[PDB]
């Protein structure tokens, strides 16, 4: 796990990867993974 945060920081990450919890009542997979496409508003394109 340690081997990746420094790599992301070098590749320009403002925050490190957080953890996934299930202690609270879990119903569906969290939304950060559900979507597949967004709009940049910087190149009039999309990105998966």
């Amino acid at each position: 796990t340690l081997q990746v945060e420094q790599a992301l920081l070098k590749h320009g990450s403002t925050v490190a990867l957080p953890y996934w919890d299930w202690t609270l009542p879990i119903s569906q997979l969290p939304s950060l993974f559900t979507e597949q496409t967004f709009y940049d508003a910087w190149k009039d394109e999309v990105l998966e």
Partner: protein, 288 residues
Amino acid sequence: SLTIGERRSLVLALQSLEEDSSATGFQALASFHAVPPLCPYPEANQRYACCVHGMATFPQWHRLYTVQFEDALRRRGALVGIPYWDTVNPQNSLPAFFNEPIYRDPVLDVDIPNPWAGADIAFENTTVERDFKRNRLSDDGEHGYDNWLWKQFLFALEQENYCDFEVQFEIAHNAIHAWVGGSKEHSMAHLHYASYDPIFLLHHSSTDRIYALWQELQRLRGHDPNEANCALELMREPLKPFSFGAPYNLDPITKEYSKPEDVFDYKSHFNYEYDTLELAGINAELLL
């Protein structure tokens, strides 16, 4: 007077910002300041830039811009706010902190190309070039400290009225721009390429510091440090593009201080403060 640790923090933060390509990156900041122009109303056919130049809102807009930069940098991780470069004193030679393209990291026992030396523009893939005139630095005057802009700032720092301050404040602000841009248009001398230059930050920090000095310069004379009476027709609207929310003005603090009136109470609204409210090795308490 910055220390080695502060230099390391600043250099790592700038190296970080000059590599990502998110909505909070160096290219993004260039976009906010200048071309591509998406102001004031993006869906309008006419294209305009948000760099309000030639009115009373120039100091407020640039102060809020520096506030956004400070928040981004401290999120990146730094121990001090972005320092200011003062040019009022006649420097013998240009400081090497950003002049030297190679910065020695002692903690990692290595060397890194300094990101403060310059940068490159995204949508043209050409590197912005840095020009200098050591003659301008040598310009001192008969008394040495009576430099070319010394008299100008002195003449600026006594106008009791507010709206007659900016009229020479702007010319003072663009004086350094001319003194550093050089012949090339792809440099500090042109509006379209201003956030591609790191020294932009230093100079505008110095300008904000001078404005802060005036904040109590007028206060000693006993008036309102947050008065914009003679600009009501222009203060009615929030500053662009900071009036927007997503996806550009991502920072909630900037979003909720997007108003131009409340930006004056900076000492208690942004927890950042210049250590020496001072001009050229002498404090204003006898400049009065």
